[PDB]
Amino acid sequence: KDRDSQITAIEKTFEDAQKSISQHYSKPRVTPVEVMPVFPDFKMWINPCAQVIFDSDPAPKDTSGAAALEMMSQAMIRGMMSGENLYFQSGNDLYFVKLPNFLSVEPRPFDPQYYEDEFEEEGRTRLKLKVENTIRWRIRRDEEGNEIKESNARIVKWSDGSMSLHLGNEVFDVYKA
């Protein structure tokens, strides 16, 4: 397809991912128990669980520990760049995603002006992998000075105990291991 059409379709995966998830696509009685956006990274926010103090009367706060630290692993980056693999964080947790040959990730934030049109049935499976089936993220600056990170992708845990990966519109059955 045209370069413009690829980019328009990629941008749509972003819009589709923000659409409200309310019921399972094949099981309309099944409802979402947790929705986690997927931001591929080699970095983690972590809270100390406790400060150890030498004063019996400390500066009062709601919660033991402290504000979050950012930590990183050089290991996590190989994998996302081979497009075979990815890590992401949700709450205090680290998830590892093992990618099948029919999905991919792009680690660098998406910017359309640098998007390369590689297409002047095994060329169609290729055009679809990179437009519909590639996990991506982008990064925006508001008119109110806010920085907005957006992802293509969502991991959903369902009311029946199952899990799916939403990539834009498309749905992939997924399993916890």
Ligand SMILES: C[S@@+](CC[C@H](N)C(=O)[O-])C[C@H]1O[C@@H](n2cnc3c(N)ncnc32)[C@H](O)[C@@H]1O
């Ligand atoms: C997290 S689940 C269910 C949580 C519920 N308290 C439970 O554990 O049974 C549904 C919620 O996830 C959020 N959500 C809905 N659509 C989403 C989307 N496209 N991307 C990220 N989060 C979404 C909304 O806040 C929605 O109410």
